[model samples]
Target: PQPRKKRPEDFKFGKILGEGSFSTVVLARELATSREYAIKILEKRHIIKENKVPYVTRERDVMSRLDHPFFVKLYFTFQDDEKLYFGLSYAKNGELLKYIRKIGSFDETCTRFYTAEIVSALEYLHGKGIIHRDLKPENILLNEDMHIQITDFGTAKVLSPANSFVGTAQYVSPELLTEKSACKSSDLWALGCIIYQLVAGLPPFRAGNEYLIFQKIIKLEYDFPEKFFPKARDLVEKLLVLDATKRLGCEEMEGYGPLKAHPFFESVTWENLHQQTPPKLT
Candidate 1:
């Protein structure tokens, strides 16, 4: 039998989890089932004013179709007269960016653990013809167990080798800047930047402003300190190559299968990732 659709009255709302100009994500409990969810409530007036109806709609549509553990999945959706509602999977530990800031940067063990899961998720998304234009720390959420859940698909879509200069400027790939196209290579480029931040405590492209960051990104000029994580220099260089044609983890390139096979991940057991207790510095 199909589960019955839920209504606003069926939930008991708690404190707001996050707030933005157009929406507020609040903790919600389904009284009847005793299950919890993160309910995103979007104000229709604000959405219309900001011309973000399509973005919100697109996020809901995309999230509903995802079933991966490393990606946030939509449980249900509904709307009231004044607002649209999205019941999404809840993350007890909040955003990864927060933990990154709190701990300064993750150690090699934690970084490898987190990066592998993200690579797996990206591979799955690419297989489904989805491009996550925006891949950043702020979009990665952490569960109680410290596993990651990539969230916020407002800028994502079902575009293969997409050509749209969209995403956080820092994580934007070189090809997206020159060729104006994004593929699995582009996402891997962002992942490389993310990995750098995870262990180095800052993004690879550092400058006084975003303009210089773009210049360095296009040039693919990033530095690694003399004493960095063992076996990480080669992996980072391979992923952050200026030429998308040479990037790793794309079907047309080395792909995630090859990445998981790399020496950098020799200690990672993909099958046991869900069971492993990720180390939390804070």
Candidate 2:
């Protein structure tokens, strides 16, 4: 039988998990079951004023269709006269960004582990014809089990129109900057930037301002530091190509085969990645 529609009164809201201009994510406990969830509350006034109705609708629709271990599960959704609510699976450990900041940077082994899991998640999304237009540490959440549960699908695309520019500046692809459209390879480019950040402790493209960053991205002007891992360097080099069609994963007919086979992920057990122990939080 289908579950009954949820209402705000059914849950007790707790601490604020995070907040944005149009939405606020709060920790909420179900009154009946006592189960915890991350409830994203969006103000109707701000949503309409900001012209994000489509994006909010897209986020809910896209999240409903996803069912992966590496992705956040949407338990239910409800709307009132003034707000929309999304009840999502609680990821207790918080964002991957927090860990990166605390540890300064990850070693190649640790980086490889997280990157492999992300690759698996991305492959699943692409196979389902979904593109995570915003793929970054901030959006990658660590659950209580320390496994990844990608959240924030507000900018996700499912082979639909992508006319507007979105995503963080550092992770944005050159093609996205030039054409303002995201292909599957655009996600790969963001992956490359993330891998670089994981090891280098900062994005590959760093500049005084967004304009300078955009210029560097358009020119494809970035270099690996002296101590960068050779295998990872090779992988990032291939993924960061300016020509979207020429990117490593895009060239192969078999999806994500070349990427998984890369030496940087030499130790990954592709079939059992989720079962593997993650690096201990320091």
Candidate 3:
């Protein structure tokens, strides 16, 4: 269903772009500046319980200050007793979830383009000692050119605490599953899951119940349907590996791996890629 508009006279609202347990997003326009932006408002209690203030403030302070064109630019942050507000750059195409869901898994060429973009983003974040622990289609925003903006830093953290279980159960890595401290590799794991979901139309591990889902994750259980693009099967096998110790990390995988070489990414410009890589979140 479409979300309601919460605009005042000058700030016009477009549509309800998204929602979460603690926040709701609305497409708002600033008439004074003739600008469009996303307004994210979160509850304070929710922020503290989930260790989110630091994560989100970090995203706002860092992501908003980033120079990359694809990443969402933060305009400002404000607050009221009930909520903390983040005004972010708008991605016209909206969430990647709707896009991938409607189309049902992109081909190799298509997957490569996005994966390449995300790799750059991940690499940049990891280099700075920060980690994007959560990566899912729901958190990615698509621009007019179909570029990706990785958002949702409510769980992002510095390298000090790597062994705590954070983020959604479905996309989490084995290391994170055990609260064994997370690392840059955790981001890679989530990214792999995102890639798999992008092509599979659902998560690699789907459970009617959360416990059963964890059981599958424990076994590294994933099924490859004949309908999957040939290269997709191999890529999924590599990214969704159960053992965190052996997982493919950004540093290990570097600029190329299943993301660039996968058959699903045939359409992407692998040899000569996009110039706008992931920008440092300030």
Candidate 4:
């Protein structure tokens, strides 16, 4: 049987989970099923005034079509004259950013587990012609099972083309900074930064301001700490190439084969990644 249409009355709103310029994500519990969801409520008037209709539309379009363990699930959508609603899966543990700060960085074992899942999600998204323009620790959420759930698709674009810069500065690729264009390899560059941060406790490129950070990113200037993992460092070096096409996962017809086979990911069971036990949340 088809699922019944959901309405505002079908849920009981709880505390606000997050806020944006024109939207608010609130914790909501379904009346009938008692399932919790993160309901993003977008103010239509503000969205129109800010001229972000296309972005809002694209976010909904991209999220509604996604079905993966590492990607947040969009259960349903509804709209009223004043607002639009997106009922999404609730990640109980919150952003990966919090964990990084609390733990002062993850161990190699934890990092590998999370990175493998992230790579799997990216592979799936890219396969479906979607470019997750924004990939960062803050955008990666931890669910009840202590697994990663990549969220936030407002900046995501279906693989058409763009020459406008988007995403956070530190993670943005060299080509994106210089030419203002993003492609599949751009996300890989961000992944490299994320991998570095997971083990180093901070982003690879660091500066007092966004300008300096962009300069470092463009120059590919970053150093590994004495304690950095050798294999992981090598992987980041390959992914952070100045030429986007030359990145580790972008080799002709290689797909994610090279990435999966990398020494850094040595023991990662790609096929059974989802079934593997995740690291303890604490």
Candidate 5:
């Protein structure tokens, strides 16, 4: 039998973990089980005001269906007069953005390991038919064990396709800038931006203005710094290609092959990734 739906009164709310335009994530401990969860409280009035009902609805819908170790888990959902609540599995280490800033940029070992986990996550999601339109640092969280727990699916599409421009501009792909279509390839393209940012301490495309940034992205006008990863350079370049159809993983018969096969990951034992301890970031 399915578990009973939860209610706000059943849990004890704690500190505000984080907040966004329309929601507040707070730590909540179930009174009966003492299980901690990061409960997302969404403001109904704010959603109505911003006309974001569809986005919020789909966020719950999509997240509820997804169950993976790398992705955050949505256990139950309920609501009161003012806000909608989502009981999510807690990741005690907090956001990945904090560590990204603390370390300036991750070393090759850290980046490769994290990127591989992200690949594992995406490959799993794509296989399950979900497109995570937003793949920025803020949306990626960290667990106590230091593994990724991707969150915030408010902008994610249930299907792996869309034409509307929906995602963070900095991580947006060239095809998204031009054709305005969202697909599995678009996410892979954003993954490249993230991988570059993980090591270079910034995204591949940037300018004084977002418009110019979009122009640079569409024109394929970015260069790797001399000190960027020597072995991993080839993989990044291939993934960042302008044509979606020609991009490394997008063109492959098996999605993980071109990437996992790249020489940059020659040291990565895909089978033992979860067992291995990633480089410690200070």
Candidate 6:
């Protein structure tokens, strides 16, 4: 909201990595260990005014207890009677979003690696009833070792098949737009949107509002560019279908979809990909 005057105990602010309407992210090292982490500084007045305090608290509560390698680790929090500070893992190379933009789009080999890792993480969180309502490259981080680490749970929800809609405008599923009950199926739906983004560098539905976006979804129509690899195109097309009832399954994941079962990935090795055999990005 205003300029951030660095506090004495706070490590020197490095680059202003990213920003939003309410919060600013800065690179900062731990005063004690000198290890780098991103500091999320939120304005208290804005929190109460927007009624987002509860939502942020719910996210922090879920994040602190989670111990997954694919998820960004939250270290500690600094809370005074007035202000709050959140310390989270900082990806030096930054978000997958940056790379996607640089390359215009991803080759299928790279897409498969990230998607597989993402699903592996999602499967773990799904078992715990936590669904990442927002799943996009901006929330996906790349480590120094070139592995994709999922981040940003500020919009995540621990849900059953009954949770109401709560997701970013672009990533929200068609079923969610219907105001239907959201579930693991909704996660699969968002995954499809993300996979399409990876292939095309834009969403399947190019919408500036909810009404038109839902209209496109209802029709199950989105064009694929010729540059999209044939196999990746096939997978993206399947996910673009408006009906969540026919969404991809784990069986489809391991058997017949983009997960190496399709002839599209004849040269790839899923197990080695997970182990970072030859990183998709260096």
User: Of the pair 2 and 4, which is ahead by TM-score?
Assistant: 4
Spell out the clash pairs found in candidate 5. none
Which number leads on TM-score? 4
Candidate 1: stretches off by over 4 Å: 280-282
Q: Tell me the alpha-carbon RMSD of every candidate.
A: 1.9, 1.5, 6.7, 1.4, 1.9, 5.2
Candidate 3 has its poorest 10 consecutive residues by lDDT at 273-282
Tens digit of lDDT per residue, candidate 3, span 1-282? Answer: 553433355577678888887688888887878888888877888889987766567667666546665468776666766777677888888788877877776765666567778876776677667777877788888876667877877667766535544678898787766666777777778887887886677888888888888888878888877777666666667667666555555455653354455555555654445554532211
TM-score, every prediction: 0.92, 0.95, 0.79, 0.96, 0.93, 0.83
> Residue 152 error for model 6, in Å?
1.9
Looking at model 5, report the run of 10 residues with the lowest lDDT sum: 245-254
Error of 1 at 157 (Å): 2.0
How many Å off is the CA of 188 in candidate 2?
Answer: 0.4
Task: Give the local distance difference test score of model 6.
Answer: 0.71
The clash count for each model shown is: 0, 0, 16, 0, 0, 0
Quote the positional error of residue 68 for candidate 2 in Å.
Answer: 0.3
lDDT of 5 by residue, 42-85 (tens): 98998999999998988898888887788899988888898899
Report the backbone clash tally of model 2. Answer: 0
Question: Between 4 and 6, whose TM-score is larger?
Answer: 4
Output the lDDT of residue 183, model 5: 77
Scored against the true structure, residue 29 in model 6 reaches a CA lDDT of 82
Which candidate, 2 or 5, would have the higher lDDT against the true structure?
2
The candidate, 1 or 4, that scores higher on TM-score is 4
| Shift of residue 36 alpha carbon in model 6, Å | 0.5
Question: Ten residues in a row with the worst lDDT in model 4?
Answer: 157-166
Worst 10-residue lDDT window for candidate 1 reads 157-166
